[PDB]
Design a protein around this ligand. Structure first.
Ligand code: GDP
Length: 330
């Protein structure tokens, strides 16, 4: 392989007594709007380049999974009111109340066969499904459907959250979060600064593809942010990687939502292929120094480990082929 040969022409470890034991380092900054997938990418590095999440670890996320599910159903139910949606069967109107009774009596996330029932019956309702399917009209968790459909398993008294349950969680992050992991004998120091560094090695910029029909426009606020980044002088010598994330939700959304909601001038077919290609182009086009700087775009499903591993392996080769010389030995 070419990246292997590239690595091989370095002579800097020879300048260190025990240089063959030295640590080559890669400072990687993770950027993107809130909920673009940054924290999930961080968890996937744990999962892929470390042990991941142990049973004991996953167990710590149970109330978060419960918290997420609860918030998800309450958001849909509360939406029905503002959107004026009727329950498919008006018996549900009594469970809706029960949801607020059970939720309104706890400080923390929980699950009971009782609550499980109320939520199952509500989720199964046509009117609720009608509200759910109109989610671009209100604030709703991305994993809402994921959890809601697996209620039975999640509800089980002796339920243990899977790694995926852990990756699907929405957790309030505050501050920079730094993760260290080794991949290909490269010691990465990964920094997630939150959607809210003059010489970083590479930058992975996350974009939630599914935010397109969310109705300044969401997609455009991310475009505005990516413009600032890839064009910033500090990042001139930094590998700019673009993760057009949530391709799974976008694949299912573009089916019934037109890209024109986001890009009014879009005239291509409303297909996953053309619509996604358009978005990439829209972003890579913000690059001023095209002659000089290249943007590395990858369509990702951050909650899909295989995809993230595949994509990260690719991302990593680009760093070796393009930035190793700027990478220090410690
Ligand atoms: N379906 C799907 N959900 C995703 C994807 N990436 C992240 N998520 C979910 O989006 C939510 C917010 O992502 P998170 O990593 O917390 O975003 P951050 O605010 O950028 O850190 C969580 O529920 C994640 O599990 C993706 O590609 N597909």
């Amino acid at each position: 392989d070419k990246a292997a040969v590239e690595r091989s022409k370095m002579i800097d470890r020879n300048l260190r007594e025990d240089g063959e034991k030295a640590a080559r380092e890669v400072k990687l900054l993770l950027l993107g709007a809130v909920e673009s997938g940054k924290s999930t990418i961080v968890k996937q590095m744990k999962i892929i380049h470390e042990a991941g999440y142990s049973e004991e670890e996953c167990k710590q996320y149970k109330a978060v999974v419960y918290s997420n599910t609860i918030q998800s159903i309450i958001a849909i139910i509360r939406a029905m009111g503002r959107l004026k949606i009727d329950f498919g069967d008006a018996a549900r109107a009594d469970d809706a109340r029960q949801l607020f009774v059970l939720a309104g009596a706890a400080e923390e996330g929980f699950m009971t066969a009782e609550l499980a029932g109320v939520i199952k019956r509500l989720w199964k309702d046509s009117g609720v499904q009608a509200c759910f399917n109109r989610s671009r009209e209100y604030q709703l968790n991305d994993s809402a459907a994921y959890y809601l459909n697996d209620l039975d398993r999640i509800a089980q008294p002796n339920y243990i959250p899977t790694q995926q349950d852990v990756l699907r969680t929405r957790v309030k992050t505050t501050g920079i979060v730094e993760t260290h992991f080794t991949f290909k004998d490269l010691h990465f120091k990964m920094f997630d600064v939150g959607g809210q560094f003059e010489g970083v090695t590479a930058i992975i910029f996350c974009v939630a593809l599914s935010d397109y029909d969310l109705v300044m426009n969401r997609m455009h606020e991310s475009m505005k942010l990516f413009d600032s980044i890839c064009n910033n002088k500090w990042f001139t010598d930094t590998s700019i990687i673009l993760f057009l994330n949530k391709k799974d939700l976008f694949e299912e959304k573009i089916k019934k939502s037109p890209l024109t909601i986001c890009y009014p001038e879009y005239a291509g077919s409303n297909t996953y292929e053309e619509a996604a290609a358009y978005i990439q182009c829209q972003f890579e086009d913000l690059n001023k120094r095209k002659d000089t700087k290249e943007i590395y775009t990858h369509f990702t499903c951050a909650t899909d480990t295989k995809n993230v591993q595949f994509v990260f392996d690719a991302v990593t080769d680009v760093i070796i082929k393009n930035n190793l010389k700027d990478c220090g030995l410690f």
